[model samples]
Target: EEDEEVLYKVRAKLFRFDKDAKEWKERGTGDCKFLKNKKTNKVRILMRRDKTLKICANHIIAPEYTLKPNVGSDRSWVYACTADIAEGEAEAFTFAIRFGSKENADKFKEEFEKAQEINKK
Candidate 1:
């Protein structure tokens, strides 16, 4: 069970941006991640792009998700989803993060340490 592979789904709200004004606007609908596998000698994982995650900025940067290897392995796999947020919402930002996961999903959270600033609050 420990060596088994698992999938996780991460979701984030939409944020808007204005080219001329150089500002962002938040949207109601959020975005989702799609998983893909490449058949190369080296393993490849890709997250497909979706309109739901589109933003109004000049270019949308992919979301970063990382998975640390089990045991003493000092390796990790970082993934970025291909989604863009649209521009033009009052908030111009995304909120209400959500994700789906299996057993190992909470492993990272348990090891993750929040910054002092966040803990202080």
Candidate 2:
């Protein structure tokens, strides 16, 4: 079954990286869902649209999944989804995300870790 192993929502700022321009294209602020499938070990992000950014933990590398610190900002942000477009494509894709707060960010990370553990069992 493709049910969510860990289910939670967070208020965050989203973006798509414009690497050539060396900047991020903001996708605006919205509540984001951190979803993982127990059997498949696939992590999916859902926010503000039908389109979703998915990562197969088995197929590609799943980084620490934490956001970088911003001096003036109240929260941290990171390219949440960064993976190859496809096999042997010589290209990558990214989806940036900014957590609403440090506490929420911590919970998100913990929850994501928990999800991974649960999926492994």
Candidate 3:
């Protein structure tokens, strides 16, 4: 399957709020994932980290599949989605691609740029 550009390219960052310290700390940065079909492109924003953060714990996927942080809720937001197309009897699968640090996020962006360039061919 071909991956299409959904919303051009956007940069995102990750932050953690220290409940004890009452501070927001930098976790990392990464690019948002874009899911495209014929009519619309959905962007999935996520934290750039080494391991996959739990969807419910991170408050990304809502129980009803709504995008998180409520857009107006006061909290750090994370996002994710499966690349699998919804079709037939096949169940959709979810996976996480994590970054070790903010620098790794930059590397992911560079890779995305290269991939886009090649995709033009």
Q: Show where candidate 2 strays beyond 4 Å.
A: 1-6, 38-42, 49-67, 70-74, 83-91, 119-121
For candidate 2, the lDDT comes to 0.55
Q: Please list the C-alpha lDDT of all candidates, in the order they appear.
A: 0.29, 0.55, 0.37
- lDDT per residue for candidate 1 within 8-57, as digits (tens), equals 23343333334577554443333332222222111111122355434322
Off by over 4 Å in 1: 1-6, 40-121
Question: On a 0 to 1 TM-score scale, where does candidate 1 land against the true structure?
Answer: 0.26
What lDDT score is found at residue 2 in candidate 1?
A: 32
Instruction: List per-candidate RMSD values in Å.
Output: 14.0, 5.3, 11.7
| TM-score (all chains, Cα) for each model | 0.26, 0.58, 0.30
Which 10-residue window in model 2 sums to the lowest lDDT? 52-61
lDDT by residue (1-121, candidate 3, tens digit) is 1554443334555544455775555554554443333333323333333345322112112222322332332323333333322232322233233344456545554544444444343
Q: After superposition, how far is residue 39 of candidate 1 from its true place, in Å?
A: 3.4
Best by TM-score: 2
Measure candidate 2: CA RMSD. Answer: 5.3
Ranking by TM-score: 2, 3, 1
Error of 1 at 98 (Å): 9.6
Q: What's the lDDT for candidate 1?
A: 0.29
